[PDB]
Ligand binder design. Structure first.
Ligand code: CHL
Ligand code: CHL
Ligand code: CHL
Ligand code: CLA
Ligand code: CLA
Ligand code: CLA
Ligand code: CLA
Ligand code: CLA
Ligand SMILES: CC1=C[C@H](O)CC(C)(C)[C@H]1/C=C/C(C)=C/C=C/C(C)=C/C=C/C=C(C)/C=C/C=C(C)/C=C/C1=C(C)C[C@H](O)CC1(C)C
Ligand SMILES: CC1=C[C@H](O)CC(C)(C)[C@H]1/C=C/C(C)=C/C=C/C(C)=C/C=C/C=C(C)/C=C/C=C(C)/C=C/C1=C(C)C[C@H](O)CC1(C)C
Ligand SMILES: CC/C=C\C/C=C\C/C=C/CCCCCCCC(=O)O
Lengths: 33, 99, 220, 214, 215, 196
């Protein structure tokens, strides 16, 4: 518990996942501009 | 690998077209959308990710990340060949011998 | 930063909490929690190792000071005796040990006499140290006598004494590391440490430790 | 199963039925009952020695493979394991597999600093725990370090442990052999094997080097 | 030290405004002109000081590094000296990063300026308002996405690191000013001046060759 | 005299033995400045190692000194009298002759010597460790019986005296063997040559 930060991770530090991408698929990063 | 093949280029072209057509027609025969991506069976002889668990999800994540990385890498291959006129190792050599 | 208790500085920074042995409770000076081989899991062996470490640290500080000072004073002239490892055979030369250059101070010429005198005096000293009691009125602590060897009375406050203990185990350990470096450099490059420092300062890019790397290569 | 308990194989065969220390019960892998120095009487020192032995075994297997492999390749000029370090000072630097433009490492301080930082971080993570796993076993963590799940069954885990520790011990012995054989002969282990195979009676230790070793 | 009422002042034992209460990092109690007598103006000045410190640290590193690389025979830049490095865009082939023709190969100054203006404006608007990299809470110490390694986790370590940042930034600002006035006076590179001074400290200095020519 | 608290220590009049060193075992002079024997099991293993090393050291010292002295006494011409040069005799065209007589051994093959020594030494070591034909339920350190044909060490007092003499003679032999090694390494000559 040292030497790093504890910190779902999306393609931007502050962004929201789209409605049609619910995160169930493997590579789902919520990336669909 | 420096070994001359016993086939003619016309025969090779026809064979490539026929074999690829047969393989892709076999592939298209599936109807389940999930098994259209991960057929399993004869294509998973070692039974690594053929169940429903956390171990298969990690393997699928790794596969998709490798797929994306290789796609970008081959786009880079093509663009480098267009611009500099070199291959992959050739581009590495040209970059190294330019400092 | 405190050097005692469970919240003291340790040997691995943030990663130390996962490798701190149970018996290393930080009740002694220089306790950083570094024991990965379990060599001090026995309380008696821990005390013996502490004694050996402190004595070695003191001797290493003395050795580092006595290897550094004579080269700077050369205010004097020695020639081939300036180097710390090259001064051993200076007695065998038919000039005597010209202390500070004056050939009238000790004028040592013989080996057996000085050797035997050193053996007897240091045998008496080390036997008294092992006994811990004798002609001198010490405080009874073998590691920290204090009674006679502290004429300035710097060890009077227990907390100040503990801080001094931490500081001098640390100075001693730095001296041990530097003395090991002195030995290895002497074997490898065969030059005085000051000469090595000057050569490094001349061009540090090429005059580093990896320049003399292929010299140990075993040829067929 | 046969590697644990009071009936495990001993390091002296039938001649060590009664020469077994009391504390070497046999619940740990690779327990052949070789402690004829009394160096593991204390359980804490025993556990620390076990961890050191496993780590050394893994490092030695990696080192043996990485000393053997570059000598067998034409691209690397069949270089010996003890001569590959100085290639960074060559006019071409270090080029992986002999292919130009692969790495082209010419600076030694840069590689040293990178190795120091990376090894520091990974060793600290191993000792204390980190992003790759927390609260796991000291020597056999698993989890992110067992992607294929080869040791889900505890019996399979024990058998693999015995196999690993034995391969590691063999690799440690082979690495010590590499060191001594490089010191004495002055040539690579693969060249020594080839010379021995060419003429076993003539090309050996006693016939060439032992006569002038003292 | 460095906090509370007993911290080290800017004159040591010879040393205070009432509004400098030893709460904010890097407060040595040196405000003689009374320019920070207003709390709002004090906050604005603190923010400008921190931003200037970070920018000056980056500038000092970027002014030292290329000339150091060039003078050691590690690269062949178009113009190693920092004040002459902006004219590389007017050379024959343009600007090449580290001297490699296949790295940047910038040729047009108009495109450089337009792209820089757009990107800098977008990111500075994000900094003052909040955008893709996070939402503004602390105007100068965001953290979260800008502290991935998590070094500013413990508040005590956070305060210590803030003090260290502000002091290294002040030193960087002083060195930036020195670099500027040396360029406007000597006309040569900074590390060049350092090497010249190290060659002959007694004879090579500002007074020996430039004090009399100033006036 | 040699046992109990009345025993002399390793520092003459000064005597600060450790707590665990009670002097019951032979050759206890209270020298544990490293504290290595704080555990009884490690102490016992170290005692066994010390006695075996001592015996082997005396045997090796005698085997190192006797042939070279015999050669220098004008008795027989050895192939190489120097103790650390006996291995080069097997590579001579004349082979290995015991005392120079070609009809005694005339060994030629190093491999055969290696194999024979390996099997014999392994068998006798296993017998010593576990218990073979020469007694089974005997002491590991001092089995006696077949190993004391003269029966000198029968009563407790003579047994203890002879054990102490054994241990101190073995310690002296180990010191002498180390001196042999260092002298040979530095002088590149025989030991008796250095003595004379
Ligand atoms: C602290 C332990 C101690 C250590 C580490 C050394 C270390 C050294 N001494 Mg010293 N000595 C030590 C204590 C003592 N010495 C001496 C008296 C001598 C003499 C008389 C000589 C040395 C010399 C040397 C060197 C011997 C090895 C070598 O190969 O030569 C290093 C040199 C080579 C090129 C060969 C070595 C650097 C010898 C030397 O070589 O001097 C030049 C030398 O002749 N020492 C005495 C008796 C007063 C000591 C008492 O404890
Ligand atoms: C029945 C006879 C038998 C004998 C005699 C041995 C003998 C030996 N086994 Mg073996 N084994 C035997 C059966 C079996 N072993 C094993 C499995 C193992 C293992 C797994 C290991 C051994 C090892 C060893 C060695 C342990 C002690 C030693 O190193 O010191 C013997 C003597 C000395 C070293 C003194 C030599 C003198 C000196 C070093 C030379 C001086 C240097 C020069 C000047 C240069 C020893 C050579 C260990 C090892 O070390 O292997 C290499 C070990 O790892 N054995 C099995 C499987 C159950 C056996 C089945 O019966
Ligand atoms: C047990 C202690 C022992 C010690 C300390 C030495 C010491 C020495 N031997 Mg000897 N030997 C020993 C046992 C044995 N040697 C030999 C056979 C030889 C040979 C053939 C030669 C030496 C030589 C030497 C010298 C150089 C080392 C070397 O060549 O490796 C050789 C050592 C071994 C192969 C170890 C043997 C196996 C191990 C004891 C278990 C060195 C002084 C050399 C010499 O004197 O040249 C000037 C040399 O030519 N030795 C055998 C027969 C297998 C031994 C069996 O116990
Ligand atoms: C245990 C630790 C260990 C250590 C410390 C070393 C240390 C070293 N190795 Mg060895 N090695 C080891 C284990 C080890 N090895 C093992 C297990 C193997 C078997 C795989 C090898 C096989 C090996 C080779 C084949 C080579 C070395 C070489 C080297 C040297 C530096 C190269 C370098 O680090 O690459 C930098 C780090 C890497 C991880 C590089 C990997 C990425 C490369 C570019 C990928 C190549 C694959 C790619 C698909 C292209 C190939 C296709 C080709 C036909 C075009 C250095 C002496 C090199 C040398 O020249 O030595 C004389 C060398 O050529 N090693
Ligand atoms: C995506 C699929 C793919 C495709 C279409 C090609 C296509 C080609 N390959 Mg490549 N290749 C691939 C993957 C692929 N490769 C992989 C995975 C490897 C590593 C084993 C290689 C290694 C390789 C070598 C070693 C050679 C080729 C060569 C060639 C050509 C001859 C084909 C052949 O003779 O097959 C026969 C099939 C059996 C052709 C342009 C040849 C070349 O271009 O020579 C000039 C040749 O020498 N390929
Ligand atoms: C305690 C501090 C210390 C310091 C300040 C120095 C300082 C110096 N060393 Mg020494 N050295 C030390 C300890 C130290 N050493 C130790 C513990 C060892 C044994 C491992 C050595 C063995 C050594 C060698 C073999 C060489 C030097 C040389 C040098 C020079 C630097 C070149 C270099 O490559 O470094 C290499 C540094 C290390 C291997 C030591 C550990 C790394 C430190 C702690 C960081 C410089 C004068 C070089 C020189 O004299 O060439 C002109 C050189 O050849 N040193
Ligand atoms: C404060 C901001 C700052 C600014 C405005 C500059 C500005 C400049 N630098 Mg400096 N520099 C800085 C900090 C800065 N630097 C730092 C911190 C370092 C150390 C890492 C350097 C080290 C440096 C080098 C090594 C080089 C420059 C060069 C240049 C030019 C950049 C052209 C380029 O191709 O960029 C394009 C930038 C990128 C595509 C971004 C990524 C670049 C790498 C991969 C990261 C320009 C005059 C170049 C030159 O012309 O110098 C003479 C050059 O080769 N700089
Ligand atoms: C083979 C090596 C050897 C070994 C294992 C022992 C073992 C032992 N000795 Mg002996 N001893 C030896 C050689 C050896 N000795 C020699 C050469 C001398 C002459 C200087 C002595 C003289 C001696 C004295 C005067 C005393 C002992 C005692 C003891 C015990 C004290 C524990 C100790 O720290 O040593 C074991 C640990 C090591 C030797 C570590 C190895 C380091 C290498 C060999 C260097 C231990 C059982 C003490 C006693 O109580 O006797 C029962 C005692 O007071 N020994
Ligand atoms: C058991 C017991 C018991 C009793 O009681 C006591 C006694 C007897 C003491 C004991 C014993 C012990 C032993 C024997 C041990 C051993 C060890 C070893 C040998 C190790 C090694 C070990 C070893 C090891 C690790 C090794 C390693 C290695 C490595 C990494 C390498 C690397 C490399 C490579 C790749 C290549 C390149 O080019 C170079 C380098 C970089 C160099
Ligand atoms: C006591 C104590 C205490 C504390 O606590 C700690 C301390 C201090 C650490 C300790 C100490 C210790 C010590 C000192 C030890 C030592 C040892 C030795 C030296 C040994 C040897 C040892 C030695 C030995 C065995 C030897 C052996 C030998 C031999 C066999 C030989 C053989 C041979 C011969 C015949 C001849 C030929 O030609 C050759 C050969 C083949 C070679
Ligand atoms: C389904 C099959 C469809 C199309 C296949 C058609 C053609 C195959 C290609 C033939 C290439 C012939 C090239 C003849 C000249 C080669 C070069 C030379 O030898 O000079």
């Amino acid at each position: 518990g040292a030497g790093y930060r504890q910190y779902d991770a999306l393609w931007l530090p502050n962004t929201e996942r789209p409605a049609w991408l619910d995160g169930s698929l493997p590579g789902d990063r919520g990336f669909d501009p | 690998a420096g070994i001359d093949l016993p086939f003619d280029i016309y025969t090779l072209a026809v064979l490539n077209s026929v074999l690829m057509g047969x393989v892709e027609l076999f592939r298209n025969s599936e109807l389940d959308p999930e098994r259209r991506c991960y057929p399993g069976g004869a294509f998973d002889p070692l039974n690594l990710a053929s169940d429903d668990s956390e171990r298969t999800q990690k393997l699928r994540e790794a596969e998709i990340k490798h797929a994306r990385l290789a796609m970008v890498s081959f786009l880079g291959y093509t663009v480098q060949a267009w611009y500099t006129g070199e291959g992959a190792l050739g581009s590495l050599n040209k970059f190294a011998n330019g400092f | 930063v405190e050097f005692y208790g469970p919240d003291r500085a340790k040997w691995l920074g943030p990663f130390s909490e996962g490798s701190v042995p149970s018996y290393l409770k930080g009740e002694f000076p220089g306790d950083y929690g570094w024991d990965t081989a379990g060599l001090s899991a026995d309380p008696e062996t821990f005390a013996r190792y502490r004694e050996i470490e402190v004595i070695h640290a003191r001797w290493a500080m003395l050795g580092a000071l006595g290897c550094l000072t004579p080269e700077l004073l050369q205010a004097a002239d020695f020639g081939e005796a300036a180097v710390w490892f090259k001064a051993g055979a200076s007695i065998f030369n038919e000039d005597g040990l010209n202390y500070l250059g004056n050939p009238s101070l000790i004028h040592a010429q013989s080996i057996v006499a000085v050797l035997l005198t050193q053996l007897v005096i240091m045998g008496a000293a080390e036997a008294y140290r092992y006994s811990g009691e004798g002609p001198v009125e010490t405080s009874g602590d073998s590691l920290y006598p204090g009674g006679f060897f502290d004429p300035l009375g710097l060890a009077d406050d227990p907390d100040t004494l503990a801080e001094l203990k931490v500081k001098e185990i640390k100075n001693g350990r730095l001296a041990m590391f530097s003395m090991f470096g002195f030995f290895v450099q002497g074997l490898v490059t065969g030059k005085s440490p000051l000469e090595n420092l000057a050569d490094h300062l001349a061009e540090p890019s090429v005059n580093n430790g990896f320049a003399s790397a292929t010299k140990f290569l075993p040829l067929p | 199963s046969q590697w644990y308990g009071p009936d495990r194989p001993k390091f002296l065969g039938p001649y060590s039925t009664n020469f077994v220390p009391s504390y070497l019960t046999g619940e740990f892998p690779g327990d052949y009952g070789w402690d004829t120095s009394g160096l593991s009487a204390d359980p804490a020192t025993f556990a620390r020695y076990r961890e050191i032995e496993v780590i050394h075994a893994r490092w030695a297997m990696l080192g043996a493979l990485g000393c053997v492999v570059p000598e067998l390749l034409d691209g690397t000029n069949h270089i010996a394991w003890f001569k590959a370090g100085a290639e960074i000072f060559g006019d071409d630097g270090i080029q992986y597999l002999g292919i130009p433009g692969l790495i082209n490492a010419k600076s030694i301080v840069a590689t040293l600093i990178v190795q120091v930082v990376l090894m520091s971080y990974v060793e600290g993570y191993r000792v204390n725990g980190g992003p790759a796993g927390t609260g796991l076993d000291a020597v056999y963590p698993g989890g992110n370090f067992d992607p294929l799940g080869l040791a889900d069954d505890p019996d399979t885990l024990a058998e693999l442990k015995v196999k690993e520790i034995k391969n590691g011990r063999l690799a440690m012995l082979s690495m010590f052999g590499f060191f001594i054989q490089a010191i004495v002969t002055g040539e690579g282990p693969i060249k020594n094997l080839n010379d021995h195979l060419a003429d076993a009676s003539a090309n050996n230790f006693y016939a060439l080097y032992a006569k002038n070793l003292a | 030290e460095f906090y509370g009422p007993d911290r080290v002042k800017f004159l040591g034992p010879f040393s205070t405004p009432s509004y400098l209460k030893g709460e904010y990092p890097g407060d040595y109690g040196w405000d003689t002109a009374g320019l920070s007598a207003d709390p709002e103006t004090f906050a604005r000045y603190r923010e400008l000081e921190v931003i200037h410190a970070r920018w000056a640290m980056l500038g000092a590193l970027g002014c030292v590094t290329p000339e150091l690389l060039q003078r050691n025979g590690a690269a062949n830049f178009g113009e190693a000296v920092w004040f002459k490095a902006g004219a590389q865009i007017f050379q024959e082939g343009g600007l090449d990063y580290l001297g490699n023709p296949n790295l940047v190969h910038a040729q047009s100054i108009v495109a450089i300026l337009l792209t820089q203006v757009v990107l800098m404006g977008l990111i500075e608007g994000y900094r003052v308002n909040g955008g893709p990299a996070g939402e503004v809470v602390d105007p100068i110490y965001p953290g979260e996405a800008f502290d991935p390694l998590g070094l500013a986790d413990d508040p005590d370590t956070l305060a210590e690191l803030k003090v260290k940042e502000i002091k290294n930034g002040r030193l960087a600002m002083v060195s930036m000013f020195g670099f500027f006035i040396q360029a406007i006076v000597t006309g040569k590179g900074p590390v060049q001046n350092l090497s010249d001074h190290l060659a002959s400290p007694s004879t090579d200095n500002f007074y020996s060759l430039y004090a009399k020519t100033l006036a």
